[PDB]
Structure formats: C-alpha cells, structure tokens
RNA sequence: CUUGAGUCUCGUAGAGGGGGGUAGAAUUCCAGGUGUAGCGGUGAAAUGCGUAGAGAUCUGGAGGAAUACCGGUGGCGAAGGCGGCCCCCUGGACGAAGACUGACGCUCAGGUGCGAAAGCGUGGGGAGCAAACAGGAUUAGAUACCCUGGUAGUCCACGCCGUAAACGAUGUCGACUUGGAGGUUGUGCCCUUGAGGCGUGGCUUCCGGAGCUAACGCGUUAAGUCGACCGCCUGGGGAGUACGGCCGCAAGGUUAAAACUCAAAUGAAUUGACGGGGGC
C-alpha cells in the first residue's frame, strides 16, 4: 500500500490541515494515488486476482465518493477531478 | 509448560541451536506441541526456526546422516 | 533501507580469504548508505550433513540496514562466487546488535 | 575369505519377500540369502518361518567371512523383520543395534492407486 | 470381495499405518503383524500383532492395550486408507510364534 | 448532527495472491564398487525382469513432480481454493487510543469479473501416476474387479471452456433474545514479578434453554423474533429434453417448453423382517 509520508503529503495537500483525513478530497486523492500506483504492479503480475479484487473494491469506492461529491457541491467536485485528471 | 511464554521471547532464533536441540528427536523430526506444552504462535516459530536452521546446515534433516 | 541477516558460508579451504570478502562487502553496503548493525566470524564449524561431499564450512553473519538494489546485487555475488557454498539473506522488522549463541559459547 | 568381524545386515522386509544381505561396512556386499531362494513361494515365500531359514541360509555362506559383529538396516515393513532378527541373534552373532530404515519421502511422488479388493 | 483377499489387503494397510503414523510411546518394538483374519462378513476383523520386547507380559499387555484404545484412531486411518465399504471393528491378539 | 459507512495514525496474526530463487528426503534412469541366481507379482498364478550380472548394497550424476515431521475437534481467502525455506511486488481482516468526513448507506434484474477437475488450441516438458490400449489371469461370461506394461493426460506458458453432492444441500445486510465448555488471535488493568488474577474485542468448534420445526434437528455464527432487497418453487415422469436465440474451435453450456402418461412420486420418524453377522 502507501507509505506514511505519500499520505502524509497528501493529505497535507488536499486536506484543510494536516489532520483532516476524513474529507472527501483527500479520501479520493489516496484512492487514485493508490491505483496509480497499483496500475505499474497489475502491468506485469497480469493473473494477480486477488489484488486486482481489492483494487477493483478502490476504484469502486472512489466512484461513490465522486458521486456523493458532485451530489454534495459540485464545485469542489470539479475542481479536484481537474486536479487529479479524471472522470474522462 | 507454554516455555516460551514465561521466557517472554518476541521471537525463536534459528541461531539458538541449544534451544532448537530440546524440540526435535534423535530423527531429527519437529515435535508437537501436544507434548510439549509449547502454545501454538511459538510452535509456528519454532516450525520456522527449525526449518531455517535446517537450510543453514546448523541442524539435520534426518538421522541418516 | 530495510534491515537485513545475511548468513553465508565459505568453502573450508578458502579460510584466510574471508576476511577479504568481509570487509569488501561492508564496504559495498556501506558505500551505498546502508550502515553495517553486527558482523560475526563463526569461523569454521562442522556441518550437520554433508554439501557437496564436504564439512568444516566457514560461518560469517552480517545485519545490515540497506536499500534493496545493493541486497540484491550482494546475492548476486553470493551466488557467483564459488567460494561461498550456501547464503541466506532474510529481513528484519527492527535493528539487532547483540551476541549470536555462536559467540557466546566463545 | 578375509576378515572383517565387524558388518552390516540389510533386511529388505518386503510383502512378499526378505532379503537379508551382509555387506562390509562400507557397503561392499559379502553373500545373500531370499525367503524365495530357501524354496519357498506362494504365501510361504513371504512368511516369518521362510525369514529365518533365509536369514540362516545367508549367515551360513558368510561365517567363512569371520563377523560375529552386526548392526542391522531394516526396511519395509513386511512380515519377516522379526524373524530375521531372532534368527541371526540365534546364529551366534553380536548385534549392537537395529534400526528402521525405510524410505519414507516428503511427499515425493506419487503412489499407486489402491486395490479394489 | 473375498475374505481372504481383503484380509491380505487390511494386513498391509495395518502395518503400514502402524509404523509410520503412530505417537504413542507405550507402542514401539518394532511392533510387526503377523496377520489379520476377518468374518465372511466384512464387518468384523482380528488382527495378531507379534511384539519383539522380551515377551514379557508387563510389555506386551500394554502394547495390547495401547493397540484396543487406539483402535478407533487405526480405524479411522484404514477406512480414508483402503477404500473399502464399513471399515470393520479391530480386533487385536498376541500372536504367540514361540511355542 | 454523529450513533451507520468510510479516512488517518501505531501495531498484531495468517498455506491470501503474483513473480523469481533455493534446499532436503523419495521414486525413476544412467555410470561405477561389492556381490550372485533369483527378483517382481497373487487368494493362488503367469505375462514381466536377470547370467550381457539383475534384484539387494555403497558412491556419483541427470531429470521431473510434490513438499514428511511441524499439523491442529489449526490459519487465510468472496467462493473455487491455499502447505518446505528465502527475497521482491501486492490484497484483505483485527486490536488500542485518539483525530477527521458528515448518511457518503443496504440490496441488486440486465451487465462485468473470478470460478475445482476433466476437456480444447498452440508450443515446451515428461520422474512418478494413469483413462484408452496391449498382454497375463480369474470367471458360465469379464468387453470389469486383480497383475505386468502403458499413450493421452497429470506439469509449465499463453488463450478457450464456465461446469461439480461448486454443500453448511442453509442468499446478502442490520437489529434484538437465557446459558455452558473449548480453540485461535488482539488488548487493558493489577499483583514481588515471570507465573498468576480480574476484564474487554475478532474469528472459530462443540453441548444445550426458550422459541421454532412434519420430524430429524436448529438453537446469539438460528432453521428463534423482526426489517430491506434479490434469486427461486408450484404432483411424479416426459425433461433440464425438444425447438429458437445467445455463447463456444469443438466437447457442449445457458435460456427453456408442450403433447402425452400415471395416481401417486416424495420427506422424516416408527415397529419388525432378511445376515452366508457380532456378543453373553
Ligand atoms: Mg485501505
Ligand atoms: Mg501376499
Ligand atoms: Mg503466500
Ligand atoms: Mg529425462
Ligand atoms: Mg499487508
Ligand atoms: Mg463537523
Ligand atoms: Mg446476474
Ligand atoms: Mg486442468
Ligand atoms: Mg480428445
Ligand atoms: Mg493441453
Ligand atoms: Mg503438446
Ligand atoms: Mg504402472
Ligand atoms: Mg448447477
Ligand atoms: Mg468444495
Ligand atoms: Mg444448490
Ligand atoms: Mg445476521
Ligand atoms: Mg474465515
Ligand atoms: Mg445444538
Ligand atoms: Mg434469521
Ligand atoms: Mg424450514
Ligand atoms: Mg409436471
Ligand atoms: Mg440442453
Ligand atoms: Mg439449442
């Protein structure tokens, strides 16, 4: 998974202070951060199952934030799904 | 019993071959822990150790040798 | 930068060439930023079954704490060089400086 | 015909034989003697009876060797160990150890499938 | 299948599984079978068990012990063992071979 | 708004998964030392093996597959499944104390993925094992069971297949309702401290209360008391078959009838009977 100074920088970057890891925003900034990641993994480990089962459970997860995000104001929605380049 | 308890140990080291001769036969073989009285996190350990200890030729696979 | 035991064994007859091999290898893992935690000279000891019709090995132990690239070019090593019989390399959640069984009976 | 005093009995203790060789103790054999070479065969070939008399038959064509010495491998566990034992513990020989060695593998390869009888 | 061919069949599954999976210190000896005979019916069958230490029967009255009170552990080896259809109830005798 | 659901921090246990190395037994084979007539096999036998020297025995080498002991009325996984050791990449679960988000939840037709074994396509590998097959027997008969051989296959890579008594024959989620005895894995506090005592979580095994059930049984991991959604059933046979569609290289899978026929088919428990049984 991630190391503690990956989330630690972003949640200090997406977060509104250095404890807010509960939002949304830096919810979602881990989750894409983690499949990106996962993506170099599931290039050559092709038949890793498993894994591929927790990281398809990540993407969905991250869907239903966006979702209630762009539910909840969709501003911030906007805003972040252009600073981390998805919903394309 | 449960030795390894009252010694507190985090973990068995394969280097401990003193420790590791008290849990194999003249076999050579693991002992279980059913006789032992060794609980069953520090009977994985020692499942470990040995095998290590084994690989490292610090301790016998068998006694036909 | 993980911690690693690093447990080789020597040809017998490559004995006084260990030393060699010691401190060249520190000097890798150190030059490398990876500090050096323990290093132990069993020395020669009898083996507990036969490897490749031989006994008597040399035993050497090292901790490290080192990135993985000059781990894994270190077994490389291990494993093309012919004078080391047997390695093993296994990794470490903390630091250990302390006596092996096989120094204390020393 | 020279002199060793000092060998090594394998007992090949199979379901339906025993074979029961002294050999010098460095694995040079010296004779041999088969359940099934004492005239036997059938079911007698594989009984404790047959043993002895092979384990007999065998000590008989080695006491020109000179051993009254034995450690025993034995192997198999067919009816006949026994046998064999208390017969050249019966011949005058000094055994000062038996021991099982029968092959058993760490899962190696697969045995055959079993009998439907 | 016949008695007698099943008989053969269940010595050497006995004495198999009585040299190898056996943890009970009061068993040993090198304990061999000499046979094992069985009912018409499958049911039932009698094993004779021929110990080594000393024929002493403070030995082997307890190998003949260790032997009935396990004889449920043996049963359940020889029934995943031998592929037969009522894995018989065990029976096990001292095979006097000195006489 | 914080009680549901999530995020962060510190840890713990694990045959969870993918990749790459490596070790030690054993089977087989090849080459030698020793050593001679049997070995192998069966309820008995022969086919088979050996005087070119087998089998047995020691040493050496090659190769493939699987990992004794530990091992567990254990553990992990959504299920299928997962078992030497080591490294690398990686998934989930749980606990303690807080901090954060603020209903972001539950279920799910269609859809997508995973999915034992056998099987299929292409290439490689091939020790053991072994459908088919070839013999040897047995038998009224043997095209079976038993024996000697033995190909596909079992193994690997990449695709296909998508079915199992795929089972706990028990859909997922949440709440509530007497107990007792264990296993396993965390954790808090206290005692002179290891030891021990008093707690408190997760998972799991076995008795059993009320209640439920046709009964057997289930029984805080419900088959109890309720709620949310989904799947499914409507006598036996015909038949999971025909036809049509969809899928598949194929084998076939999936969806799924009707005519006709019969008055039953079925589940659980009860009393006996039948042994060419067993005890007294
Ligand atoms: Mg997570
Ligand atoms: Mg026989
Ligand atoms: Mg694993
Ligand atoms: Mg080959
Ligand atoms: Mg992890
Ligand atoms: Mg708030
Ligand atoms: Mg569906
Ligand atoms: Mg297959
Ligand atoms: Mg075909
Ligand atoms: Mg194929
Ligand atoms: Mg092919
Ligand atoms: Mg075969
Ligand atoms: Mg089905
Ligand atoms: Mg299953
Ligand atoms: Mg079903
Ligand atoms: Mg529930
Ligand atoms: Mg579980
Ligand atoms: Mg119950
Ligand atoms: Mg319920
Ligand atoms: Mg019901
Ligand atoms: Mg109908
Ligand atoms: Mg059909
Ligand atoms: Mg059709």
Redesign the pocket.
């Known amino acids: ?2 190391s ?1 100074e990956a ?2 920088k972003i ?1 200090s970057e997406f ?2 202070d250095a ?6 925003e ?2 979602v900034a ?1 989750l894409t951060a ?1 499949i990106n ?2 993506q ?2 599931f290039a ?15 993407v969905s ?1 991250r869907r ?2 966006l ?2 995000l762009k ?2 104001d969709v501003a911030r929605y906007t805003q972040l799904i252009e600073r981390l380049g998805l919903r394309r | 019993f ?1 030795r390894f ?4 140990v ?2 068995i080291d394969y280097k401990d071959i003193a420790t590791l001769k008290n849990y ?2 003249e ?8 006789i032992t009285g060794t ?3 520090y ?6 150790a ?3 200890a ?2 490292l030729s610090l301790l016998p ?2 006694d ?2 | 930068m ?1 911690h ?1 035991e690093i447990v080789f064994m020597v040809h017998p007859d490559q004995s006084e060439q260990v030393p060699g091999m010691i401190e060249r290898y520190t000097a890798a893992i150190t030059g490398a930023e990876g500090k050096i935690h323990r290093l132990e000279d069993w020395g020669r000891r009898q083996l507990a ?5 031989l006994h008597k090995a040399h035993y050497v132990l090292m901790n490290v704490e080192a990135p ?1 690239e000059v ?2 070019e270190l ?1 490389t090593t291990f ?1 093309f060089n012919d004078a080391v019989i ?1 390695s ?4 470490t ?1 903390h630091a250990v400086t302390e006596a092996s069984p096989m120094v204390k009976a020393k | 015909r020279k002199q060793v005093s000092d060998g090594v009995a ?1 007992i ?1 203790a ?4 025993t ?1 029961v ?1 002294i ?2 103790r ?7 003697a ?4 004492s005239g036997f ?3 007698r ?2 009984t404790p009876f047959a043993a002895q008399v092979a384990a007999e038959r065998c000590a008989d ?1 080695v006491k020109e060797y000179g051993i009254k010495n034995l450690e025993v ?1 034995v ?1 198999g566990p067919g009816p006949g160990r026994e046998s064999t034992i208390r017969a050249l513990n019966a011949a005058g020989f000094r055994i000062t150890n038996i021991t099982d ?1 029968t ?15 | ?2 008695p ?2 099943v ?3 269940m010595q050497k599954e006995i004495a198999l599984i009585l040299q ?1 999976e056996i ?1 009970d210190p009061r068993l040993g000896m090198m304990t061999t079978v000499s046979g094992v005979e069985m ?3 499958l ?2 069958a009698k094993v004779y068990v021929t110990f080594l230490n000393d024929k002493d029967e403070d030995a082997v009255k307890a190998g003949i012990k260790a032997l009935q009170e396990a004889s449920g552990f043996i049963r359940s080896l020889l029934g995943k063992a031998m592929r037969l259809r009522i894995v018989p ?1 065990l029976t096990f005798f001292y095979d006097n071979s000195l006489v």
């Open positions: 998974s991630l503690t989330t630690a949640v977060g509104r404890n807010d890891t509960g939002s949304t830096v919810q881990l983690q990641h996962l170099g993994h050559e480990h092709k038949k890793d199952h498993h894994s591929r089962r927790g990281l398809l459970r990540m997860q239903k934030l979702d209630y539910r909840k | 449960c308890t009252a010694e507190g985090q973990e194999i036969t076999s050579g073989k693991i002992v279980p822990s059913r609980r069953a996190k009977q994985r350990q020692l499942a470990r040995i095998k290590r084994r690989y696979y068998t036909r040798h | 993980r690693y079954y036969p490897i490749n019709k993985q781990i894994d077994e494993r047997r093993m390399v296994m990794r959640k | 394998h090949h199979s379901f339906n034989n074979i060789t050999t010098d460095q694995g040079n054999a010296l004779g041999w088969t359940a099934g070479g065969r059938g079911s070939k594989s064509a491998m192997k060695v092959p058993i593998p760490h899962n190696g390869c697969r045995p055959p499938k079993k009998r439907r009888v | 299948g016949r007698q061919r008989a053969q069949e190898r943890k009912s018409r019916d049911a039932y109830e």
